[PDB]
Structures are given as C-alpha cells and as structure tokens.
Amino acid sequence: CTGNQQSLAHSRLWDAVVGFLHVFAHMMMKLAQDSSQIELLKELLDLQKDMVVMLLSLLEGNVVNGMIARQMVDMLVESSSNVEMILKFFDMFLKLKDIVGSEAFQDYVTDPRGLISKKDFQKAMDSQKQFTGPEIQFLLSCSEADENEMINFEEFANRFQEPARDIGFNVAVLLTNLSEHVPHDPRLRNFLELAESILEYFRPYLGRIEIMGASRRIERIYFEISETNRAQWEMPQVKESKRQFIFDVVNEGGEAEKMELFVSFCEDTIFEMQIAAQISEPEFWGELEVQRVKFLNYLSRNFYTLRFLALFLAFAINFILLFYKVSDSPPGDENMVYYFLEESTGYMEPALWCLSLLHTLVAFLCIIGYNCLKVPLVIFKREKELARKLEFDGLYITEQPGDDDVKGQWDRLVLNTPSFPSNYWDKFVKRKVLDKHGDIFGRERIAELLGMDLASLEITAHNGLLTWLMSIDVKYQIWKFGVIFTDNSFLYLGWYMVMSLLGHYNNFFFAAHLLDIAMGVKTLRTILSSVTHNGKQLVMTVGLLAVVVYLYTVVAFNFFRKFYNKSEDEDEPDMKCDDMMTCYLFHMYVGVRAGGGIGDEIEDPAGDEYELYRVVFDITFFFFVIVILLAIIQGLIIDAFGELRDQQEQVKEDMETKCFICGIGSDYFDTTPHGFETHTLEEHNLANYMFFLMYLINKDETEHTGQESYVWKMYQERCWDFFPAGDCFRKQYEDQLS
C-alpha cells in the first residue's frame, strides 16, 4: 500500500534503527566470548533478521529515484562504524567454515580425536593468510580454551553458521537493492567498498528478475538461489533438455504461446530436479526395505551406464557369432547342425552361454531402472495436462472428448479415485474445479463425477503383507499402467527385453540388438534424421514407382510378349511375361535393379516392325523410372540435410538478436558497451525465472511478500502478464534518469 509506504518515511523510524544498529554492533562482538551466552546471542541475531526484513519490505514498489530510497542511504551513512563491525563479524566466521574441512587445515591435526591445543589456530590461520592479526586473536577469545588442549573445531564451526548466512544474505540484498536504484551517490559507492566481501560471497546465490505488475510498471525482485538447485541446473542431462526446449519453441512453436510453453517446461524441470534429489545416495522387514530402496535408486542413478552395457554385450555376442558353420556330418541329406569353428582354444562356447545370461539380466535391469527414473515424469506430464483441462476448460464438465482420440476416453477412468494428483503438486485440484463449475452445473454431480468425497460426509473436519492389498487402488493402477504401456520408450525397452529372452531359443536373435541401439549413440541419429525427415514422401515416391512399372507391364504384356524368353533352346516355356502377375514381378524385381531399365534382360529387338515401337518403350523406362525416379529418392535425402541445418541456423540467429522475454532487439541494448550480453545474464535470464518458480513453490504460502504473492496469484490463474514483453527497466526507469 502506497499510503503506509510514505507514512513511515516521514517518521522517526530511521532514528530507531540507528540506535538498534549501535547496540547490535557492540553486543555480539562482546557476547561471543566465553561461549556461555549463545542463547542470548542467538536471540540477538534473530532480532537482526526481522529489522532488515522490514527494511526490505519498505523498498517494494520503490521508484528508481524515490524519497524512501534516498532516506535509507541517509540512515546507513550516519550508521557507519557500526554496520561495518556487523559485516566484519560475519566475514570472520564465514571464512572459518571454508577454512575448516579443507586440505590445508586437515594437515594440522595431531591426533585421531581431532583438536589443536591453544595456538595451532594461529599456525592454521597463517596458512591461507586471510585473517588479520587482530582478527585471529579475537576468534580464540570467541572460542573456548578447553583446558588449553581440547579445542574442537567441528563444533566451533557449526555455532554461528546458519544465523550468519540468513542475516548476511538479507544485508547483501538490501545493499544491492539501493545501489541498483540510486546510481549517482558517492557516499553509497564508498560505503559498498567495505561491504564488497559480503557482496562477493553471496553473488552466486543472489537472483534478479524483472516482473511487471501491481503498479503498471517494471519492478525488480530479488531472491535466493540455493546451492543444490544451481548444481542440478548444470547437469548435462538438464542442459541438453534445455537446448531441446529452446529449439522446439523457436521453430515448432510460436508467439502467443511462448510464455505458456516456458512455464510448462519450468514445471517439468522442477519435477526432474525433485526426482534426482531423492535418488542420490550420499546424505527384519525394515532392513530388507532399506536394501531394496537403495538398490532401486542404484539402478536409477546408473541407467545410462546400463545402456552402454546392453550394447557392449550385443557387440561381444555378435563377434563370436561370426564363427558359425554348417556341416552335414556333425563333430558333436538332412540333420544340418551349427557349431563354433574358432580353430583355437575352446574358450568361446562357454563365453556364449555366459554372455547370453548376462545380456538378459542387463536388459532386464534397464526396464526396471527406466520404470523408476523417467516414468514418473511421464505421469506428471499427463496428470498436469488433465488437471489444467478440468479447471480452465471443463473438458469433462461442459464439453466432451472428441470421441476419436483415445487419450480423452482413457483419461475418464482416473478422475474417480482419491489418488488423482499422485505426482502433480496441486492436491486441491478436485475442490478448485468444484468451486469453478459447481454452481452452473450440479454441485453433487461434480462430486460423483470426480469421485470426490461427498459433501454430506464432508463435515469440514468436525471430529503387513495382508495389509498391503487394501491400500492399492485398482482403478488408478490400471490407468497408470495403460499410460506406461503406450509409451514409445518403454515399448522399445520392452521389445529389447523380449528379444533377448528370445535369444536363448536361438542365439542368432541377438543380432537384432545390434541394429536398433548402435543408431542411437551420439551422431547416427542425426544422419538417420535425414532419411526419416521426409519419411512420408520417400514412401509415396515408391508408390509412384509401383504405378509407373504397372503401366509398363500392361504395354509389354499386350504387345511385346515374345521378347521375354529367358531361355536358350528346348526350354521355350519360360517366358516370364505370359501372365500379369509374373510380368509385374519380373518388371518390379529385375526391372529397376538393372542399370539400363528393362532392355538389359529382354532379348535384342532386331528389325520386326516393332524395333522403333520398343526402343521408345525401353528408353522411356530408363528416363522415367531410373534416371528421374531414383533421383527424387536421392533428391529428398539431400534436401533434408539442408533443411535441418537451416532450422538450427535460424535458432542461433534468433536467440542472439532478441531477448526471448522482451521483444527488444540486441541493437537497443548494445548502445551500452556489452549491454546485450549483460542484459541477458543479469536482468532477463532463463535460469533466474526458472529458479523463481522453484522458489515460490518451496516457500510457504504464508511467508510470501507483496510481490511474490502477487506473482503467485497470477501463476495459479495461468495469466502470464507479469513477464515484461515490452520493457526492460532501462527503457522506463532509466531512459531519462539513467
């Protein structure tokens, strides 16, 4: 509210914080000694957090050059020599955490128990010379003597770690909030120099967005990016998925839906990070369940190391299959046998049985690992789409499925059980659609249609092995497995498993695994993406060949039936043109493999009054069927190579001349030196927006602020009006104010 924002500006609140800062600076620096008053110190740090949080809330809808912003710097400059002690105290303890647990400090330990008596801290501090002379001696007072021999650094490090981080980050956000707003203030600039250590430490975690709303103007918003979230964003799997999304949106997608697709990709990426977090290993039925859970996550983590094993075995098995031989007389006219002929040590027959058993096990572990690594994402991507259709479209309330798509009909089975949002985060999707469509239509009809608990029994909260099979929902499991069994990736892995099982019946079935896998390694897919890009057109050309040759069969069958004598003498009844079916087979099988058309096998047309009537027949076969119709086949592969390249060239030339969030080109931002490069890495960024969604969902709905709650309200309404799309906070607040 603007009224209360200005009211506290024309007040004595600034005179109250300065007194609070003065006591706080000298209090913790004095309370830290003797370690006997940590509870008071911990409570003291708690009061510090609430002051800056209130200060941040005073800078929510601030203009670039506002009175409130200009007053806060006035408070800070007069509060000098006190906040610096606060920052210096934070810096001293933060550096210790990095120093402890490192190789340099681990070399100064003297006993297995772990301790440094009284002054080895100075020796440890001298190495990695960061702490000043006065600083290190202050820390010893801040620690305990412990009979001058038992200073435990493990507990000492974890004393003021969490309290320092929360206060330190909020100070950094507050300091950078003013700096980015008031550009011309020499007092503020020199004030930031002594606070550079705090800013330089919290740079990786300080986010920055440019949401627009609540004032019809662009507003910057700051937040915290966790270490784990940033680590998961740099995984090769995530980065590759990001590149695929950008490629799809630029070419396959288009405007008026780019923001809708981006948020959907943002939600999918968050769920992927959720799955990868719960499968990480680091950090009597009970024992069995623990082993099974760890074993299952072992397969999920090592899924791509198993696909490289199912291929290595298929290459090894097929290598020893090159020694097969057929003999009428078996070494160990019917009864033809197959046996190894290695002509060397017989260490290959046992190898085939050993490797065949191993391949089936590996090919079976992949389908289990896939069922617990990528299947949940498929279920999440399908539950989410159904949920957004019930509420914002009423697909099962007002409209009906088109009756020709199996997805609409099969999805009707799941909206009856009390487990519909099993993987989707939105647990209240049943009540939300009830409150959105339960008035126009039957309020109880929606309750029974969705299988939701009846309002009659909804009293608004008035108040072993056998036990397993009443906790399993029959309908939901049937629906879930129907989605899995129609998945393309699962079916391919299912086909891989059954063929390996079939390979024991006959050992030559293992050659099929050589084909479908070697194509998908790193680059054969791209080569295979030219043949199958024009796949619909490479088949119709063949269908055109089967028609042209038919029309040539009709003419050759009625007029040139004496020329097809495929015999020399006394064997005249060969004549592979006497009936339509054989002539078509002759003109199709050996009718196009020949280089000369059909004249390479038909007997020579000497002077028969039909020599000129057949030369035209022969020479048109060569042109229309061979020279031309086999040039279209080679003319479609070549164009495919030049179409996929141009598809990727456009993406590179479209992401380097636009902002992907605004519509402003790179020329406008380039007036400032390296402006566009800075604009796309700090102000507008895919990671920053993605990390915000992971931040809104993680944060409780009761802990939101003026800007976060406004965005969260729009996010649940699926109204992406908070993306700028027309401004960049430099065209509005700094076009003239700079």
Ligand X SMILES: Nc1ncnc2c1ncn2[C@@H]1O[C@H](COP(=O)(O)OP(=O)(O)OP(=O)(O)O)[C@@H](O)[C@H]1O
Q: Is 469 in the site for a second copy (CB under 8 A)?
A: no
Residue 203, binding choice from ligand X, a second copy, none, Cβ under 5 to 8 Å by partner class: none
Nearest in space to 374 (alpha carbons), one of 278, 280, 300: 300
Nearest-angstrom CA–CA distance, 557 and 561: 5
* Secondary structure (3-state) at 726: coil
Residue 684, binding choice from a second copy, ligand X, none, Cβ under 5 to 8 Å by partner class: ligand X
The CA angle 212-217-223, to the nearest 5 degrees, is 45
Nearest-angstrom CA–CA distance, 576 and 602: 10
Q: Is 523 in the site for a second copy (CB under 8 A)?
A: yes
Provide the minimum distance between the beta carbon of 212 and a second copy in the complex, in angstroms, as a whole number. Answer: 27
Nearer to ligand X (CB atom), residue 198 or residue 711: 711
- In the window 413-452, what residues touch ligand X (CB under 6 A)? none
Q: Is 712 in the site for a second copy (CB under 8 A)?
A: no
Q: Does the annotation place 97 within a ligand binding site?
A: no
Q: Does the annotation place 655 within a ligand binding site?
A: yes
- Among the listed ranges 90-98, 199-207, 268-276, 653-661, the one in contact with ligand X (CB under 6 A) is 653-661
CB 2 within 8 A of CB 61: yes
- In the window 219-248, what residues touch ligand X (CB under 6 A)? 239
Nearer to ligand X (CB atom), residue 131 or residue 233: 233
- Judged by CB under 8 A, which of 277, 663, 718, 738 binds a second copy? 663
Residue 239, binding choice from a second copy, ligand X, none, Cβ under 5 to 8 Å by partner class: ligand X
Tokens matching residue 45: 């740090």
Q: Does the annotation place 703 within a ligand binding site?
A: no
Q: In whole angstroms, how far apart are CA 556 and each of 544, 545, 589, 620, 627?
A: 19, 16, 16, 13, 20
Q: Is 352 in the site for a second copy (CB under 8 A)?
A: no
Q: Does the annotation place 686 within a ligand binding site?
A: yes
Nearest in space to 267 (alpha carbons), one of 489, 431, 428, 426: 426
- Judged by CB under 8 A, which of 67, 361, 519, 681 binds a second copy? 519
Provide the minimum distance between the beta carbon of 478 and a second copy in the complex, in angstroms, as a whole number. Answer: 38
Q: In whole angstroms, how far apart are CA 375 and each of 165, 372, 382, 469, 650?
A: 38, 6, 11, 23, 33
- Among the listed ranges 148-156, 288-296, 334-342, 654-662, the one in contact with ligand X (CB under 6 A) is 654-662
Q: Is 87 in the site for ligand X (CB under 6 A)?
A: no
Residue 693, binding choice from a second copy, ligand X, none, Cβ under 5 to 8 Å by partner class: none
Q: Is 630 in the site for a second copy (CB under 8 A)?
A: yes
Nearest-angstrom CA–CA distance, 323 and 317: 11
- Judged by CB under 8 A, which of 536, 572, 573, 609 binds a second copy? 536
Cβ neighbours around 231 below 10 Å, total: 10
Crossing angle between the packed helical segments 67-78 and 161-179, to the nearest 10 degrees:
130
Nearer to a second copy (CB atom), residue 44 or residue 517: 517
Q: Which residues are bridge partners to 218 per DSSP? A: 212
Q: Does the annotation place 468 within a ligand binding site?
A: no
Nearer to a second copy (CB atom), residue 106 or residue 128: 128
Q: Does the annotation place 264 within a ligand binding site?
A: no
- Judged by CB under 6 A, which of 659, 694, 711, 728 binds ligand X? 659
Q: Is 719 in the site for a second copy (CB under 8 A)?
A: no
Q: Does the annotation place 644 within a ligand binding site?
A: no
Nearer to a second copy (CB atom), residue 386 or residue 549: 549
Q: Does the annotation place 398 within a ligand binding site?
A: no
The CA angle 581-582-584, to the nearest 5 degrees, is 65
Residue 540, binding choice from a second copy, ligand X, none, Cβ under 5 to 8 Å by partner class: a second copy
Using CB atoms within 10 Å of the CB of residue 157, give its burial: 0 to 12 exposed, 13 to 18 middle, 19+ buried. Answer: middle
Nearer to ligand X (CB atom), residue 258 or residue 431: 258
Q: Is 696 in the site for a second copy (CB under 8 A)?
A: no
Tokens matching residue 325: 């031989």
Nearest in space to 218 (alpha carbons), one of 596, 654, 683: 683
- Could you please report the per-residue DSSP string of 320-343? HGGGEEEESS-------EEEE--S
- DSSP secondary-structure letter at 722? S
Q: Is 651 in the site for ligand X (CB under 6 A)?
A: no
- Among the listed ranges 89-97, 344-352, 405-413, 534-542, the one in contact with a second copy (CB under 8 A) is 534-542
Residue 627, binding choice from a second copy, ligand X, none, Cβ under 5 to 8 Å by partner class: a second copy
Residue 660, binding choice from ligand X, a second copy, none, Cβ under 5 to 8 Å by partner class: ligand X
- In the window 661-690, what residues touch ligand X (CB under 6 A)? 661, 680, 684-686
Q: Is 129 in the site for a second copy (CB under 8 A)?
A: yes
Q: In whole angstroms, how far apart are CA 147 and each of 42, 144, 153, 443?
A: 25, 9, 15, 74
Residue 47, binding choice from ligand X, a second copy, none, Cβ under 5 to 8 Å by partner class: none
Nearer to ligand X (CB atom), residue 168 or residue 724: 724
Using CB atoms within 10 Å of the CB of residue 340, give its burial: 0 to 12 exposed, 13 to 18 middle, 19+ buried. Answer: middle
Give counts: helices (H), strands (E), the chain: 35, 2
Q: Is 628 in the site for a second copy (CB under 8 A)?
A: yes
Provide the minimum distance between the beta carbon of 684 and ligand X in the complex, in angstroms, as a whole number. Answer: 5
- Among the listed ranges 119-127, 334-342, 637-645, 658-666, the one in contact with ligand X (CB under 6 A) is 658-666
Residues 6+ apart with CB under 8 A from 42: 163
- Judged by CB under 8 A, which of 440, 454, 478, 498 binds a second copy? 440
Q: Is 541 in the site for a second copy (CB under 8 A)?
A: yes
- Judged by CB under 8 A, which of 444, 527, 608, 648 binds a second copy? 527
Q: Is 618 in the site for a second copy (CB under 8 A)?
A: yes
Nearest-angstrom CA–CA distance, 577 and 587: 9
Q: Does the annotation place 90 within a ligand binding site?
A: no
Q: Is 26 in the site for ligand X (CB under 6 A)?
A: no
Nearer to a second copy (CB atom), residue 254 or residue 596: 596
Interface with a second copy (CB under 8 A), residue total 89
Q: Does the annotation place 399 within a ligand binding site?
A: no
Tokens matching residue 462: 């008035």
Per residue in 4-28, is it b (16+ CB within 10 Å) or e — as a string?
ebeeebeeebbeebeeebeebbeeb
- DSSP secondary-structure letter at 732? S
Residue 562, binding choice from a second copy, ligand X, none, Cβ under 5 to 8 Å by partner class: none
Nearest in space to 582 (alpha carbons), one of 573, 594, 571: 573
SS (H, E, C) 398-420: CCCCCCCCHHHHHHHHCCCCCCC
Q: Does the annotation place 702 within a ligand binding site?
A: yes
Interface with ligand X (CB under 6 A), residue total 10
Cβ neighbours around 255 below 10 Å, total: 7
* Secondary structure (3-state) at 113: coil
Provide the minimum distance between the beta carbon of 240 and a second copy in the complex, in angstroms, as a whole number. Answer: 19
Q: Does the annotation place 203 within a ligand binding site?
A: no
The CA angle 641-642-646, to the nearest 5 degrees, is 120
Binding site for ligand X (CB under 6 A): 239, 655-656, 659-661, 680, 684-686
Question: Binding-site residues for Ca(2+), please?
Answer: 702
